Design a protein around this ligand. Structure first.
Ligand SMILES: *C/C=C1/C(=C/c2[nH]c(/C=C3[NH+]=C(/C=C4\NC(=O)C(C=C)=C4C)C(C)=C\3CCC(=O)O)c(CCC(=O)O)c2C)NC(=O)[C@H]1C
Length: 308
């Protein structure tokens, strides 16, 4: 059972209680984007990341109480139509906004709350890349093709296929890596390195990232959803702040930027496409959607090859 988060008197997480960190409700985001939450009926802005002015041109206390009908007149109708009450929380509305300078808008619904993520935005290849995954003659070749394809798409310094054993230990079973990096191929890691609540979250929410492993989280205020007087679920928000314990592991590994995609086989977390960059690095939003698609395609191909 989860500890309370830090803003509800919960303890700072240690290695004795890795699995009890409520990573889905950090009440904070990464600073490379802005997050608002809004009432799913009124469009009233209820919560604001403290950096909202950087991206949206208005202070949190000025955005607070304004409606999405006022703030996003061109998107609000489509947004309402796209994400009705009771729709799946995996369902996304996506728009490209003109900003005086594009801004990618990603929206999902959790209960009666809309969660709005704003971050800056920037097939012949992909088709051949899919056919390459399809064409791999065994699981090892599939793993190698998948890591090299993702490295070519992203430019990440390292792309690993990280496979879970039945005891939830992990192993790097393939990797594409920059010249000069030390090999992790064949290295195994304890189950606690990706604790049980992270594995559960990653079965439902298939991509997460840390753009800068040194960056302080930006608070969401007010931190509790005024609808519920309870924490705002951020498991479906790519801007969600990462566990400080996970961020520290990456810094100690010389990793400035991390991104992973779930590999899901018969509804169980099989592994991760796990990416590192030495330098902080914001993967463009369009490249993430492509990487989510490849994760789904890889998941289907892994299920087939392992039966053999
Ligand atoms: C006491 C808690 C600890 C802990 C928690 C923790 N770890 C994650 C997430 C990840 N850990 C990963 C581990 C590895 N990445 C590698 O490259 C290697 C080895 C080469 C390992 C072992 C990975 C891949 C993830 C997923 C996220 C990512 O892709 O960067 C979480 C969840 C983070 C979040 O989503 O907020 C947590 C709570 N890790 C520990 O090592 C102990 C100290």
């Amino acid at each position: 059972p989860f500890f309370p988060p830090l803003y509800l008197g919960g303890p700072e997480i240690t290695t004795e209680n890795c699995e009890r960190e409520p990573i889905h409700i950090p009440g904070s985001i990464q600073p490379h984007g802005a997050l608002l939450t809004a009432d799913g009926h009124s469009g009233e802005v209820l919560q604001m990341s403290l950096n909202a002015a950087t991206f949206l041109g208005q202070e949190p206390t000025v955005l607070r109480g304004q409606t999405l009908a006022a703030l996003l007149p061109e998107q609000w109708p489509a947004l309402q139509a796209a994400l009705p009450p009771g729709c799946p929380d995996a369902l996304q509305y996506r728009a490209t906004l003109d900003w005086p300078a594009h801004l990618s808008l990603t929206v999902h619904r959790v209960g009666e709350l809309l969660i709005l993520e704003f971050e800056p935005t920037e097939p012949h290849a992909l088709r051949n890349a899919m056919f390459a995954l399809e064409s791999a003659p065994n699981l090892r070749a599939l793993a190698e093709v998948a890591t090299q394809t993702v490295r070519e798409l992203t430019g990440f310094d390292r792309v690993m296929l990280y496979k879970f054993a039945p005891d939830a230990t992990g192993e790097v079973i393939a990797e594409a890596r920059r010249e000069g990096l030390h090999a992790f191929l064949g290295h195994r890691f304890p189950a606690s390195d990706i604790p049980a609540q992270a594995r559960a979250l990653y079965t439902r929410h298939l991509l997460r990232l840390t753009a800068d492993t040194r960056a302080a989280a930006v608070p969401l205020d007010p931190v509790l959803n005024p609808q519920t007087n309870a924490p705002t679920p951020l498991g479906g928000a790519v801007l969600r702040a990462t566990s400080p314990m996970a961020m520290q592991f990456l810094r100690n590994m010389g990793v400035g930027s991390s991104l992973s995609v779930s590999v899901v086989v018969g509804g169980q977390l099989w592994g991760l496409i796990a990416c590192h960059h030495q330098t902080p690095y914001v993967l463009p939003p369009d490249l993430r959607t492509t990487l989510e698609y490849l994760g789904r395609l890889l998941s289907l191909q892994v299920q087939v090859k392992e039966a053999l």
